[PDB]
Amino acid sequence: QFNPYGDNGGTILGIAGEDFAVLAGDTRNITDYSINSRYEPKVFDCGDNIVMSANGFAADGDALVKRFKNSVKWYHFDHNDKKLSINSAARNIQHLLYGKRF
Amino acid sequence: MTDRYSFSLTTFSPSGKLGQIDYALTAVKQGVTSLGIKATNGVVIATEKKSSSPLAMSETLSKVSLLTPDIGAVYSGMGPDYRVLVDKSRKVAHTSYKRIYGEYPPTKLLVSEVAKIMQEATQSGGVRPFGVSLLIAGHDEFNGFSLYQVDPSGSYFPWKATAIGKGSVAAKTFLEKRWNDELELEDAIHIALLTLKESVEGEFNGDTIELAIIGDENPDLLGYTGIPTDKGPRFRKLTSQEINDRLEAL
Amino acid sequence: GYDRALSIFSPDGHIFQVEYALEAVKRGTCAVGVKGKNCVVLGCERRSTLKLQDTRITPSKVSKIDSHVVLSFSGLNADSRILIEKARVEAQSHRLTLEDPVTVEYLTRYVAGVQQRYTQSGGVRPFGVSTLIAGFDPRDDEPKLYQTEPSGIYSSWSAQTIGRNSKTVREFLEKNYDRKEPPATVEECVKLTVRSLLEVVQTGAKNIEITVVKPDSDIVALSSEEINQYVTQIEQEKQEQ
Amino acid sequence: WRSYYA
Amino acid sequence: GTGYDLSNSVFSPDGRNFQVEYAVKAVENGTTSIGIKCNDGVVFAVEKLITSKLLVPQKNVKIQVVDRHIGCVYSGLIPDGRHLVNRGREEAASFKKLYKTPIPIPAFADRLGQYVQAHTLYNSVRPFGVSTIFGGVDKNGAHLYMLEPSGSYWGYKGAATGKGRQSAKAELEKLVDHHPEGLSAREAVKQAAKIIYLAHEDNKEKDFELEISWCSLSETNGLHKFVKGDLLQEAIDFAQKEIN
Amino acid sequence: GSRRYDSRTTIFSPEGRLYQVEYALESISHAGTAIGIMASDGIVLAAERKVTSTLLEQDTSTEKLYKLNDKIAVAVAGLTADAEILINTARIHAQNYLKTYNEDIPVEILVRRLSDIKQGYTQHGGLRPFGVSFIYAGYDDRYGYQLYTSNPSGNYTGWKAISVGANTSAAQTLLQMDYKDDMKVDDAIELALKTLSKTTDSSALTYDRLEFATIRKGDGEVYQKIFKPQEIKDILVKTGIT
Amino acid sequence: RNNYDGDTVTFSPTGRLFQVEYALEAIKQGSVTVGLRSNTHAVLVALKRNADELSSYQKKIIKCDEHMGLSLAGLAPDARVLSNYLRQQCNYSSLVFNRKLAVERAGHLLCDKAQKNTQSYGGRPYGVGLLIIGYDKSGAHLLEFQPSGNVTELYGTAIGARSQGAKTYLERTLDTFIKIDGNPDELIKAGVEAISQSLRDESLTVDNLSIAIVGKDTPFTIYDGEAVAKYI
Amino acid sequence: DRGVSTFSPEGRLFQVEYSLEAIKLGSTAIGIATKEGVVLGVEKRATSPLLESDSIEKIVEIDRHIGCAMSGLTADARSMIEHARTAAVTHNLYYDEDINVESLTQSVCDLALRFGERLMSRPFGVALLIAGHDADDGYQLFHAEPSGTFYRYNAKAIGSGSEGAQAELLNEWHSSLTLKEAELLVLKILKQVMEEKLDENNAQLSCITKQDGFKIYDNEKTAELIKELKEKEAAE
Amino acid sequence: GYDRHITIFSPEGRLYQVEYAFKATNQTNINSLAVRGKDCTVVISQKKVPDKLLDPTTVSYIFCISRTIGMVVNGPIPDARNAALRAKAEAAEFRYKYGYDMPCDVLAKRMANLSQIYTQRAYMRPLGVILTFVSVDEELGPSIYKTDPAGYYVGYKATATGPKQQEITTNLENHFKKSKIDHINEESWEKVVEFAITHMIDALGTEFSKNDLEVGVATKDKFFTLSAENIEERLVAIAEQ
Amino acid sequence: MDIILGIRVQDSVILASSKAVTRGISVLKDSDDKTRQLSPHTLMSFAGEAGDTVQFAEYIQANIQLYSIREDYELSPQAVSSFVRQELAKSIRSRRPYQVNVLIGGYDKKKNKPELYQIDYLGTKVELPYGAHGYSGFYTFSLLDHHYRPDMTTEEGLDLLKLCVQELEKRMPMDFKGVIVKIVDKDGIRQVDDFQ
Ligand SMILES: [Cl-]
Ligand SMILES: [Cl-]
Ligand SMILES: [Cl-]
Ligand SMILES: [Mg+2]
């Protein structure tokens, strides 16, 4: 049967300092027991000083990041180039995700 | 590019007249005379096939139309309207009756159905009424023979005899004279040809007259044998010859 | 889909179809409501040009919405049914989803919203109706009385009247209603109501109907005997020099 | 005059 | 009409549709544009009025392509022309998707026409404010066509429409005598420039910019191409010479 | 585009009246008179046919009195074909109500729904009103014998006796005089026949120009009778009009 | 005219569509705005209009992408609509094709969007004019949009009331400013002069002046208020 | 009877311009911006004395940081408010933050033009003063019309008195005004243009401040403010 | 009144828009006639190309509907091609749904029925065309059926359409009065084409060139149209008799 | 398997209904009133799938209440049980059918007769002197067949019911935390508050 999901591996890590934050991941992309790329970046700069990574099924991971980035672009268009607070982004991503709850 | 006429095109005037019905009736009045007569063992409907060119082949055009094997219709008014009404009527007789009860509808109910189709053209959005009156004649097992008139308004009425169209007021009086409740079918066929004779001024023969009857069942017109409870159709259009034969004996 | 705009603006800023709907109300029987200290009364007139009508079955002009709320109206009768139904349905929906009956204001705001919607939706004409909606909030003793009009506007009133000759009846009420001391008794609140209809009904007491709404879903309409009893005495205290 | 125009 | 010209699908008492005739006035008031059919292709040319020296030259293209083999040009309400061409582009893709072969020119002609005629059927739409000249090379020849707001269309040896239509038709009828055994793709380009220049003398008040395209089985391999660069100047020149 | 031809059928006059409803009522005023009178023990419906010819068949003709249900009937005044539309939906509604509750539909609920439908054609959709007015005669185990009328506006009201169609102001005045609350069925029958003969625009009142029906107590049930042509001629002699 | 201008689905006996023409009249009542471009940048200068001494000044310039924007003169609500549709197209092109929307194609898309509202019964034409600038793969660009549907590419222009002043000036100074390449501050000045030729009893201030610029290595950005002090 | 979306020969939409006339007949409303908050006031204008003037609601809350005052066909405003309140709550659900005052104004104006034959049949017959606070542009007052346009005003008056009352504000308003100064100034200008003697029953005050949000003043507070104003005047 | 503009009745009972549609059918000033052979059917029509710039081969009012049905249109080409496509469509669908070839008379009823509709629904105009359908039917033999904007249709021994309909009609009437049969008793279609071109000339009083005409033939097997050369051959023969 | 019992004695109808609400491993509540008052003289009890049960009941409630206000009249119990069966009979062929069973007990103020009606989630309806839903019938029907008399007093019925509840406490594996009992008679609906 057609299975719409896959697994491209990956591990990511994010740590919050006092005046800083880091978000890291390996740059290896896999399928089953094969290597797809030894450098396929998975941690992205989205503007307004937000970095994002959506690890797991990479097609879904990219789709989500693409869509969040668009959310930022339209936040500006719709609210006088206001910066997007990290906490506000977090709420918005909850909605991006729950939209596809099923 | 879509029907943006959602509103009624037939409305009450301040006098209470529904204009477009009134005008539709006028169009009926201009139409050729048609008539029907009910007898004790048959019904007859007749009209004039006034051709619109000697190059036209009159047989390719029927004003008298079989609705069910037991019901016939004739009209006066705008022919093309009658035509699409015969289609609608034949279909409704199936979809709303035969496919449900396994019988053809009885005369009143089919007439009732045609009425509803015309009534609706009097009220629905963006359409004119039909411009015809219909005479429907037929027979069912529990009501016997029957003759009905249906008007552009959707009204219908049952008749012993009547006429509609051009010389209708004249012919109505002629029929009131000659009609009793003891006529055999052959008697009424006679009266019909006579009543039609005044409303017709030119040639009057079996090629210019259309006439059909609801009478006995013609098992010879059935097409198949072996089902004894299928008796075959009571409607029958008379041939050109069958008309003349009675025209000499007039 | 017939959606033509029937309520539109004309050059002086009027919306004639709503204004003409108000004209429908003016032609309608008179309706009046009075607030007491512990009750509300609604009164209506019955057109006396029709002497042969069955009063058992002709629909009254005062309608229960829920068991604690009533609505009377002046205007086109048939239009009134649509408002009354919508309102009865909404009250039951409120009980379902909030586990609490509507406040008298809430039910009013709802009716008025419907009336307003019909003044800027394609394909529809405004309601030829104005309402008086009365009752007591659940578990509350303060009487409530509101009025709505075809435009969708609504407000609350110590006493109020609508329909034909309401100018007269309102004058009477404006010159007989002490806000500071409102009718202290049921019996005398119904008195003030009948009195104000008599400025404009005259005629008989079978051409008036009265309804008393009291707290905790206590709603009752009076009989001709009860109502005529107020017609007399009112007409007797009259004749008195 | 008219200030309904940008 | 005497009331008979306020809606679109309405017959006047002598059988006319004034609203279409009023659309034709919009076409007639348009810029001049032509098509010349040759022995193996078609040439299209159009007049670009330089309203103002502020218009960027070379840069307001007017001839539109459909698929790869069909060329279109129109006179009148430009946005109406773009609209029709878009419909044609849809119509050519639909036809190719199902039948595989790129749409034959007569088949394309009727796709447009049916659509334009469609816009004369109902009083909830107005006719197209454009006449359109189009054609191309298909499995059996070159074809030139012109299509009126009424939806009428026929195949032409050459065609013109717009303000300079009359000068143009006159010069095209001449073109069919001298060069009547046939007209070659390259000469048809030249003659095109001549006709646009001669036609420009109405509208002499303003300057104009010539624009030509062709579709020649031998010179473009059956594909629609814009005549630019040298071949264009050669035609601009041949026009200057032949007007004196 | 098409907005040019819309007769706006759902608008108010500057006086606050509904044009097409008023014009439709004007129409109804030219229709054969129909009467309903409620007795203590039955109801009487009598109406006059505007369609009359020697050759018209009257045994099988219906133009004014229609059975909605075994316990409700209508007398029609207006466009007889508009009536049939509304009638069949009503006949359904009664059957729908029976399916849902397994009780016959109370007379008023049926009258309300038929009138609500009319009211709709008055407020949205841009169609013309139904040119119809109804007198409803029914019995239910909650109000007993009931008599109602509805008209194009969608307004309905109940009556002790009432009339619709032509010459109603005349007929209503005759009914106001001679109606007494304690009347019996046969009294009511003759009051109705005598009201028609005084308002008919016709020469005389003959059986070939009437429909007639009575709802009366039957058995411990309620029988509904639509007189046949012969039964009408009889009642016309019995009360002395022939 | 009376008999031929109650909708956009009626031609005049002479070929006009009055509803479209009455639409253009709204543009003429709008406040003046100018566009002009070199080979490397494209500039918008706009005169913002206020209602009172107490009201703000109506914005006239709208970013559409990092490489495209417009100024508006006419019904501001309509410009919101059209600029929104333009942002959507820019965004679709970016998302589906990883390709910036060419300015020519924006014009074409705009024209077609508007043309729908001159053949549509029950609709109305757009009541606004648009000057569109951008930098794409074929360089700097300036477009003029009219509610008729006609989108035109120019070196410069101006629209709105008293627009003729700026227009004639740009036709005069043409050969000069096309050559203003690689000097944005000097191209803006050219635009600020052009719009100046269109004032009547009014002088440019920090509150009413508004300027936008884009070009090779300069994304579309908007200057208002103190930012525009430099240029007066 | 032409079509509701029709342009006039001078470039104006008929139904919108007729709509603006109805606004001119509406009870007066005034709003004033001050670095201490923003004040909204309205003429209640009860028709009869039996009308309980408390049920006259021409100032409503949109969110804790945004208030609204109306003038015109007020029944038309119910759904503009309902949409505005929904935009305020929805924006918070989606972004875990308060909506900006202008962004909510822009949202209200987007309804204004959604009519034709195009969900609503006609434009709104009511105008709005929208006053609020957000952390990007502080205190703000906006004027929204059924045309779909809107301006930010330091002070603005709409309705019957507007033409004159606005000329008053142009003279009396300055940037260093205080909340109490604008309170009285709103009472003053209202008292001049109303036809009845202004009292705490046919006029209503309310404001919006960052710390306390949007409150509608209770009769007591307004009355104690009317007196203070009668006195500052008699002190000539 | 507006009953001149859309397809509703006049107080006379008339549809002016249907009448004005008939008038447009003559707007081409082109005449046509059709006659029946022993086993073929011929339609002939004038061909007028006045513009030297036109490609004469693309100018026709004769359409091949199915393999067996030909249709000649009297009226403006845009409505004519609209009609032709719909018929081509109706005939392909009929074959698919029912398994035989749609008969000429049946296609006529179907198109006349569609025609009727535009006289009754207000949002559509009639077509300014008269459709002449011809075939050699597998049940009825050679057939001519014609439909007009009124929704009318019928079958003809022969028929003629256009501005000079009357001259042609009375010509053919005389011939059928003398011959006493319902067809041209000639067994070659080439002869029957000649008969047609002949009686066309004698009734219009004009000679024809090979480019003045347009000719269509229906045989059992198929319906085809003649070339300029197949015509010149016809014309030559007429001159030798 | 909740307990839905109903018995119709001569002057009234008695509904006894299990009080416990157990989700899986825990008993969440021991005071649950599995009843809705459909009108002053009609009481309906119900048992079945989780959310479906109350949703259906309160839906039926609101509908009968609306009918009451509109006609200022209280539908007979026969009429209510017909509307109720109709709803369920519609439900069963719907996408997600309501999985609810109900008893309907009412006093027909017009016949002056009590009436008890049993309807299962399929829309099966029967008029009975006594009824139960689910497994409850299996222990109690033999008791009721024996001691039931059509002329029993309300107090005799209660005694007979007490007997039925005691047998359920003996032989049924589930602790259903006792019953709430309600009586319906000419005077409306009262709850027997001290039942064993
Ligand atoms: Cl129809
Ligand atoms: Cl609605
Ligand atoms: Cl400001
Ligand atoms: Mg209906």
CA distance F21 to chain G (A): 29
CA distance F143 to J146: 43
What CATH number is given to the structural domain containing I178?
A: 3.60.20.10
| Domain count along chain E | 1
Q: Show residues of chain H in contact with D4, CB under 8 Å.
A: 12, 147, 149
User: Tokens standing for E113?
Assistant: 């026409």
- Chains E and B share 3 or more Cβ pairs within 8 Å: yes
Q: Which ligand is nearest to the CA of F125?
A: 2
- What is the rounded distance in angstroms from the CA atom of residue E72 to the CA atom of residue E61? 12
Which tokens is H192 given?
A: 């001049």
CA distance B2 to J37: 52
How many CA atoms, within 13 angstroms, populate the side-chain half-sphere of residue E130? 20
> Domain locations in chain J?
1-196
Closest residue of chain H to F2, computed from CA coordinates: H3
Which chain A residues have a beta carbon less than 8 Å from that of G85? Answer: none
Question: What residues have CB less than 8 Å from J112, skipping those under 6 apart?
Answer: J186
Cα(E90) to ligand 1 centroid in Å equals 35
How many whole angstroms separate alpha carbon F140 and alpha carbon C52? 21
HEC string of J36-96 equals EEEECCEEEEEEECHHHHHHHHHHHHHHHHHHHHHHCCCCCHHHHHHHHHHHHHHHHCCCC
Distance I13 CA to ligand 4 centre (A): 28
* CA-to-CA dists, residue F239 to F101, F217, F233, angstroms: 43, 22, 10
Query: Are F121 and F127 within 8 A, CB to CB?
Result: yes
Determine the Cα–Cα distance for residues E64 and E72; give it in Å rounded to an integer.
5
Q: G99 alpha carbon to ligand 4 midpoint, in Å? A: 56
Nearest CB to F15; choose among C23, C52, C55 = C23
Q: B touches which chains (3+ CB pairs under 8 A)?
A: C, E, F, I
Q: What DSSP string describes J93-135?
A: TSSS---EEEEEEEEETTTTEEEEEEE-TT--EEE-SEEEETT
Q: In this structure, are residues J75 and J64 in contact, taking their beta carbons and an 8 Å threshold?
A: yes
> In a 10 Å sphere around its CB, with 0-12 CB exposed, 13-18 middle and 19+ buried, how is residue G33 labelled?
buried
Dihedral angle, C-alpha F207, F210, F215, F216, nearest 10 °: -30
Contact residues on chain D for G30, CB-CB shorter than 8 A: 5-6
The strand order across the sheet containing C40-45 reads C159-162, C31-35, C40-45, C208-214, C218-221
| Residue C116 alpha carbon to ligand 2 centre in Å | 10
Contact list in B for residue C4 (CB cut-off 8 A) is 7
Residue J150: Cβ within 10 Å count: 8
Counting ligands in written order, the one closest to the CA of G207 is 3
Burial class (CB in 10 A: 0-12, 13-18, 19+), B76: buried
Task: In whole angstroms, give the CA distance from residue E225 to residue F105.
Answer: 79
Q: Does H3 touch chain F (CB under 8 A)?
A: yes
Q: What is the largest CA-CA distance in chain J?
A: 48
- Which of chain D's residues have a Cβ under 8 Å away from the Cβ of G75? 4-6
User: Helix or strand or coil: residue B157?
Assistant: strand
DSSP labels, C52-114: S--TTTSPPSEEESSTTEEEEEEE-HHHHHHHHHHHHHHHHHHHHHHSSPPPHHHHHHHHHHH
CA B54 – CA F176 distance, rounded (Å): 68
For the CA atoms of chain I, what is the radius of gyration? 18
- At J84, list the tokens: 């109720």
The domain of E17 spans 1-244
Structural tokens at position C72: 């009377």
Enumerate the residues of chain H whose CB falls inside 8 A of the CB of residue G27: 11
**Whole-angstrom Cα distance, residue F241 to residue G12?**
71
Q: Where residue E186 sits, what CATH number does that domain have?
A: 3.60.20.10
Task: Specify whether the backbone of I180 is left (phi greater than 0), alpha (psi in -120 to 50) or beta.
Answer: left
**Inter-chain residue contact J62 with C92, CB threshold 8 Å:** yes
Q: Do B125 and C4 touch (CB under 8 A)?
A: no
Supply angle C-alpha J132, J134, J140, rounded to 5: 45
Which residues in F lie closer than 8 A to residue B181 (C-beta atoms)?
A: none
E203 Cβ under 8 Å from any chain I Cβ: no
What six digits make up the tokens of B2? 């879509």
Q: What contacts E20, CB < 8 A, 6 or more positions away?
A: E8, E120, E127, E149, E150
Q: What does the CA dihedral E180, E185, E186, E190 come to, rounded to 10 degrees?
A: 60
Q: Which residue of J has its CA nearest to C66?
A: J69
Distance CA J137, CA A72 (A): 64
**Ligand nearest C3 Cα, by number?**
2
Alpha helix (H) residue ranges in E153-212: 165-175, 185-199
Q: Which residue of chain E is at minimal alpha-carbon distance from F3?
A: E124
Instruction: Report helix, strand or coil for F197.
Output: helix
Q: How many CB atoms lie within 10 A of CB I130?
A: 26
Provide the 10 A C-beta neighbour count for residue J32. Answer: 15
Which residues touch A98 (CB under 8 Å, ≥6 apart)? none
Q: Chain B closest CA to E115's CA: distance in Å?
A: 11
Phi and psi at E122, nearest 5°, equal -145, 145
Fold of G1-232: Glutamine Phosphoribosylpyrophosphate, subunit 1, domain 1 (3.60.20)
**How many other C-beta atoms lie within 10 A of the C-beta of residue B180?**
9
As for how many domains chain I has, the answer is 1
Subunits touching E (CB < 8 Å, at least 3 pairs)? B, F, G, I
Task: Please name which of H149, H152, H151, H191 lies closest in space to residue H168, comparing C-alpha atoms.
Answer: H191
C144-148 sheet: strands from edge to edge: C62-64, C69-75, C129-135, C144-148, C154-156
Chain E positions in Cβ-Cβ contact with residue F3 (cut-off 8 Å): none
Q: What's the length of chain G?
A: 232
- Helix (H), strand (E) at residue G20: helix G18-29
What residues contact C128, with CB distance under 8 A and at least 6 apart? C21, C24, C25, C28, C75, C76, C79, C150, F12, F16, F18
B10 CA: distance to closest CA in chain E (Å):
20
Q: Look up residue B14 and give its two tokens.
A: 């301040």
Residue B88 CA to residue B111 CA, distance in Å, equals: 12
B185-199 and B168-178 helices, crossing angle to 10°: 150
Shortest alpha-carbon distance between residue B169 and chain F (Å): 12
Q: Is G70 helix (H, G, I), strand (E, B) or coil?
A: strand
Name which of C7, C11, C173 is nearest H18 (Cβ-Cβ).
C11
- Is residue H103 a contact partner of residue H97, using CB atoms and an 8 Å limit? no
Please indicate whether chains B and F are in contact, defined as at least 3 beta carbon pairs under 8 Å. yes
- Spatial separation of the C-alpha atoms in residues I69 and I47, rounded to whole Å: 21
Q: Which CATH architecture has domain J1-196?
A: 4-Layer Sandwich (3.60)
Residue F165: how many CB atoms within 10 A of its CB?
Answer: 25
Q: What Cα–Cα distance (Å) separates residue C141 from each residue in C136, C195, C215, C217, G56?
A: 6, 25, 6, 11, 51
How far are the Cα atoms of B62, C77, I10 from residue B80, in angstroms, in the given order? 12, 45, 18
Using CA atoms, how far apart are residues A85 and F150, in angstroms rounded to an integer? Answer: 66
DSSP state of E160: E
Structural element, H or E, at residue G109 = helix G103-119
Record the tokens describing residue E99, joined without a space: 């039948």
In this complex, do G91 and A73 lie within 8 Å of one another by their Cβ atoms? Answer: yes
Q: How far apart are CA A49 and CA I162, in angstroms?
A: 80
Separation between Cα atoms, residue H53 and residue H48, nearest integer Å: 10
User: What is the rounded CA–CA span in Å between residue G1 and residue H62?
Assistant: 47
Instruction: Please check whether residue I63 is in contact with residue I230, taking contact to mean a CB–CB distance below 8 angstroms.
Output: no
Measured CA to CA in angstroms, residue E237 lies from E32, E197, E209 at distances of 20, 11, 13
Q: Ligand nearest F123 Cα, by number?
A: 2
Q: What are phi and psi of E84, to 5 degrees?
A: -55, -45
H or E element at residue G93: helix G76-97
CA–centroid distance, B121 to ligand 1, in Å, is: 6
Interface test with C, best of H24, H55, H120, H147 (most C CBs within 10 A): H55
* CB contact (8 A) between residue C54 and residue F6: no
Spatial separation of the C-alpha atoms in residues B195 and B166, rounded to whole Å: 13
Tell me which H or E stretch contains B22. Answer: helix B19-30
State residue H113 phi and psi, 5-degree precision.
-100, -10
Residue B12 with chain F: CB contacts under 8 Å: 20, 23-24, 26-27, 128-129, 131
Tell me the β-bridge partners of J37.
Answer: J43
Contacts for E147 with CB less than 8 Å, ≥ 6 apart: E109, E112, E113, E116, E131, E132, E133, E134, E153
Looking at domain B1-250, its CATH class is alpha beta
What are B155's two structure tokens? 């009204």
- What is the C-alpha separation between I81 and I112, in angstroms, rounded? 16
Token pair in block for residue E120: 């004369």
- Calculate how far, in angstroms, residue J82's C-alpha sits from the geometric centre of ligand 4: 27
Active site residues of E: 31
User: For I137, left (φ over 0), alpha (ψ -120 to 50), or beta?
Assistant: beta
The amino acid at residue I18 is V
Q: Searching chain E, which residue's CA lies closest to the CA of residue G174? A: E54
Do J2 and J90 meet the contact criterion of CB atoms below 8 Å apart? no
Whether E123 contacts chain F with CB within 8 A: yes
H-only helix segments in chain C: 16-26, 77-98, 104-117, 166-174, 186-198, 224-238
CA dihedral angle for residue H205, residue H209, residue H212, residue H215, rounded to 10 degrees: 20
Task: Specify whether the backbone of B223 is left (phi greater than 0), alpha (psi in -120 to 50) or beta.
Answer: left
**What CATH topology corresponds to F1-242?**
Glutamine Phosphoribosylpyrophosphate, subunit 1, domain 1 (3.60.20)
How near does any CA of chain F get to the CA of E122, in Å? Answer: 9
What are the sequence ranges of the domains in chain G? Answer: 1-232
CB atoms within 10 A of CB B230: 13
Test G56 with H152 for CB contact under 8 angstroms.
yes
Resolution (A): 3.0
Q: What is the CATH number of domain H1-236?
A: 3.60.20.10
- E201 by Cβ neighbours in 10 Å (0-12 / 13-18 / 19+) ranks as exposed
Residue pair C28/C74 in contact by the 8 Å Cβ criterion: yes
Which residue, chain included where needed, has tokens 């035609």? E235
d(CA B10, CA I9): 10
The contact set of A with H (CB < 8 A) is 78-80, 82, 85, 87-88, 90-92, 95
Length of chain J: 196
Cβ atoms of residues C27 and C13 within 8 Å: no
Ligand nearest to the CA of F89: 4
**Owner of token pair 């047609």:** I196
What residue type is F180 in one-letter code? K
Which helix (H) or strand (E) element contains residue E141? strand E141-147
Give the type of residue at E193: A
Report the residue of E31, E65, E77 to disrupt the G interface, i.e. the one with the largest count of G CBs within 10 Å. Answer: E77
> Within chain G, what is the greatest distance between any pair of CA atoms?
55
Report the alpha-carbon distance of residue E37 to residue E182 in Å, rounded: 9
